[PDB]
Design an enzyme around this catalytic site. Structure first.
Site, mmCIF file in Angstrom:
data_model
loop_
_atom_site.group_PDB
_atom_site.id
_atom_site.type_symbol
_atom_site.label_atom_id
_atom_site.label_comp_id
_atom_site.label_asym_id
_atom_site.label_seq_id
_atom_site.Cartn_x
_atom_site.Cartn_y
_atom_site.Cartn_z
ATOM 1 N N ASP A 18 -12.112 -3.252 12.388
ATOM 2 C CA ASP A 18 -10.904 -2.834 11.676
ATOM 3 C C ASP A 18 -10.280 -1.595 12.304
ATOM 4 O O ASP A 18 -10.688 -0.467 12.011
ATOM 5 C CB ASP A 18 -11.238 -2.580 10.204
ATOM 6 N N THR A 19 -9.244 -1.812 13.116
ATOM 7 C CA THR A 19 -8.514 -0.710 13.726
ATOM 8 C C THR A 19 -7.736 0.119 12.714
ATOM 9 O O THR A 19 -7.292 1.226 13.054
ATOM 10 C CB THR A 19 -7.549 -1.242 14.785
ATOM 11 N N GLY A 20 -7.560 -0.383 11.489
ATOM 12 C CA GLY A 20 -6.874 0.369 10.462
ATOM 13 C C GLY A 20 -7.734 1.293 9.640
ATOM 14 O O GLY A 20 -7.205 2.010 8.783
HETATM 15 C C1 LIG Z 1 -5.008 3.650 4.959
HETATM 16 C C2 LIG Z 1 -4.786 2.354 5.781
HETATM 17 C C3 LIG Z 1 -5.568 1.092 5.312
HETATM 18 C C4 LIG Z 1 -5.213 0.565 3.902
HETATM 19 C C5 LIG Z 1 -3.720 0.246 3.728
HETATM 20 C C6 LIG Z 1 -7.093 1.359 5.418
HETATM 21 N N1 LIG Z 1 -7.980 0.240 5.024
HETATM 22 C C7 LIG Z 1 -8.461 -0.668 6.081
HETATM 23 C C8 LIG Z 1 -7.650 -1.983 6.081
HETATM 24 O O1 LIG Z 1 -7.893 -2.747 7.261
HETATM 25 C C9 LIG Z 1 -7.988 -2.890 4.885
HETATM 26 C C10 LIG Z 1 -9.425 -3.460 4.970
HETATM 27 C C11 LIG Z 1 -9.768 -4.359 3.806
HETATM 28 C C12 LIG Z 1 -9.973 -3.815 2.537
HETATM 29 C C13 LIG Z 1 -10.281 -4.636 1.455
HETATM 30 C C14 LIG Z 1 -10.385 -6.021 1.628
HETATM 31 C C15 LIG Z 1 -10.183 -6.573 2.896
HETATM 32 C C16 LIG Z 1 -9.871 -5.742 3.972
HETATM 33 N N2 LIG Z 1 -7.053 -3.997 4.772
HETATM 34 C C17 LIG Z 1 -6.179 -4.135 3.749
HETATM 35 O O2 LIG Z 1 -6.058 -3.399 2.793
HETATM 36 O O3 LIG Z 1 -5.423 -5.247 3.980
HETATM 37 C C18 LIG Z 1 -4.551 -5.697 2.924
HETATM 38 C C19 LIG Z 1 -3.298 -6.283 3.530
HETATM 39 O O4 LIG Z 1 -3.730 -7.538 4.069
HETATM 40 C C20 LIG Z 1 -4.716 -8.097 3.175
HETATM 41 O O5 LIG Z 1 -5.849 -8.562 3.873
HETATM 42 C C21 LIG Z 1 -7.010 -7.747 3.567
HETATM 43 C C22 LIG Z 1 -6.699 -6.988 2.281
HETATM 44 C C23 LIG Z 1 -5.169 -6.941 2.231
HETATM 45 S S1 LIG Z 1 -9.065 0.548 3.764
HETATM 46 O O6 LIG Z 1 -10.010 -0.575 3.729
HETATM 47 O O7 LIG Z 1 -8.244 0.904 2.603
HETATM 48 C C24 LIG Z 1 -9.955 2.031 4.280
HETATM 49 C C25 LIG Z 1 -11.065 1.940 5.121
HETATM 50 C C26 LIG Z 1 -11.712 3.108 5.509
HETATM 51 C C27 LIG Z 1 -11.215 4.330 5.061
HETATM 52 C C28 LIG Z 1 -10.107 4.408 4.220
HETATM 53 C C29 LIG Z 1 -9.459 3.251 3.829
HETATM 54 C C30 LIG Z 1 -9.772 5.831 3.845
HETATM 55 C C31 LIG Z 1 -10.847 6.688 4.552
HETATM 56 C C32 LIG Z 1 -11.762 5.704 5.335
HETATM 57 O O8 LIG Z 1 -11.721 5.926 6.760
#
Ligand SMILES: CCC(CC)CN(C[C@@H](O)[C@H](Cc1ccccc1)NC(=O)O[C@H]1CO[C@H]2OCC[C@H]21)S(=O)(=O)c1ccc2c(c1)CC[C@@H]2O
Lengths: 99, 99
Positions: free
Chosen positions: A25-27
């Site tokens: 996860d690059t995000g």
């Molecule tokens: C801030 C950017 C981003 C969130 C917008 C950061 N996320 C990572 C991102 O890839 C998440 C991963 C994921 C979460 C749950 C379920 C599946 C996948 N994907 C996401 O929400 O995807 C949305 C849109 O598409 C859909 O598919 C998947 C879910 C829906 S995190 O998980 O919230 C995170 C992680 C580490 C850390 C933090 C925050 C804070 C400190 C720590 O470093």
């Protein structure tokens, strides 16, 4: 290897003597793993994303193997719906985005 | 380009004629942008993240350019903490993970 993104980039990892599936996860700045009873000391933390925050336990210097590539760094443990390998470990295994 | 992950993979995007910054997010199935006015009809949708579920406006077949690469796809608009480019558009620009 090269991983296309048609499907979720899930890979097998090894942590605390257990094998699990996790997202590359690059995000994610840091790594977040599903609830597990890891040994050692930890610090409480709150991490935010879509939908709000969850409470996690922050462990430091945790060894993780990702597709046979070894890495060691911070792992956040808590009620995440998915195991997430974040940039803190992806840099260590040599992972890049390419287009 | 080849993008390392020692920093957040932020890029400039163009959507609806507006330049914005967004995060290349391999852990996101979908693309979600912060509240904005977009030219297009939309449908109410729900999406779930690390902290729970939010209501979003779903815009289908929207033109969006990402670091000079053109895509046309679904864009969700709503209270995400950060503009994220998810796999539905990463695949369109030919993005892969490599290590
Ligand atoms: C801030 C950017 C981003 C969130 C917008 C950061 N996320 C990572 C991102 O890839 C998440 C991963 C994921 C979460 C749950 C379920 C599946 C996948 N994907 C996401 O929400 O995807 C949305 C849109 O598409 C859909 O598919 C998947 C879910 C829906 S995190 O998980 O919230 C995170 C992680 C580490 C850390 C933090 C925050 C804070 C400190 C720590 O470093």
């Amino acid at each position: 290897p090269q991983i296309t993104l048609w499907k979720r980039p899930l890979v097998t990892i090894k942590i605390g003597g257990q094998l699990k599936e996790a997202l590359l996860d690059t995000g994610a700045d840091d790594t977040v793993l599903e609830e597990m009873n890891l040994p050692g000391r930890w610090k409480p933390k709150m991490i935010g994303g879509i939908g709000g925050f969850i409470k996690v336990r922050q462990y430091d210097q945790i060894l993780i193997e990702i597709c046979g590539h070894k890495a060691i760094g911070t792992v956040l443990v808590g009620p995440t719906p998915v195991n997430i390998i974040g940039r803190n470990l992806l840099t260590q295994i040599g992972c890049t985005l390419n287009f």
